[PDB]
Design a protein around this ligand. Structure first.
Ligand SMILES: [Ca+2]
Ligand SMILES: [Ca+2]
Ligand SMILES: [Ca+2]
Ligand SMILES: [Ca+2]
Lengths: 145, 14
């Protein structure tokens, strides 16, 4: 129910590496800012510290994998403001048409430094797609969060 | 994959 499996853990660990650019096992504010800006955002140094802070359970300044996994376990359960998820959707939906295509996901992942085959891309779409049109619309993006 | 969910998850921290 509320339980992440062995493979769900491995997928989160993989995701964690997107943010941990140097693979030292911690996300710094600097690494967060570079991810944020690669997604069209522009947080300030203080905003980046606030972000880290909501997640930084041990107060050491960085996010390790356990802290990341904790935040993700929790975010899987909770519901966000319509406009928090709307802003997230807009990063993927580059042409504003209301549908995240495989190409748009490929663009976002590439800009994030990620090496994706289009069987890996189609499969990501496959998981989020509810109606079967081969794209991700807003409703399906919501349900996914 | 948990890329999209974590990207959105991180967005939400802001
Ligand atoms: Ca790092
Ligand atoms: Ca920490
Ligand atoms: Ca689109
Ligand atoms: Ca769909």
């Amino acid at each position: 129910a509320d339980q992440l499996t062995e493979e769900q853990i491995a997928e989160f660990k993989e995701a964690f590496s997107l943010f941990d650019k140097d693979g030292d096992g911690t996300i710094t504010t600097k690494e967060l800012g570079t991810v944020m800006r690669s997604l069209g955002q522009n947080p300030t140094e203080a905003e980046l510290q606030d972000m880290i802070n909501e997640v930084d359970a041990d107060g050491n300044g960085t996010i390790d994998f356990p802290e990341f996994l904790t935040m993700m376990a929790r975010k899987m359960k909770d519901t966000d403001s319509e406009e928090e998820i709307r802003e997230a959707f807009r990063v993927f939906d580059k042409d504003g048409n209301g549908y995240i295509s495989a190409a748009e996901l490929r663009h976002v992942m590439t800009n994030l430094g990620e090496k994706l085959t289009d069987e890996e891309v189609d499969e990501m779409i496959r998981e989020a797609d509810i109606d079967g049109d081969g794209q991700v619309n807003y409703e399906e993006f919501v349900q996914m969060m | 994959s948990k890329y999209i969910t974590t990207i959105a998850g991180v967005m939400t921290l802001s």
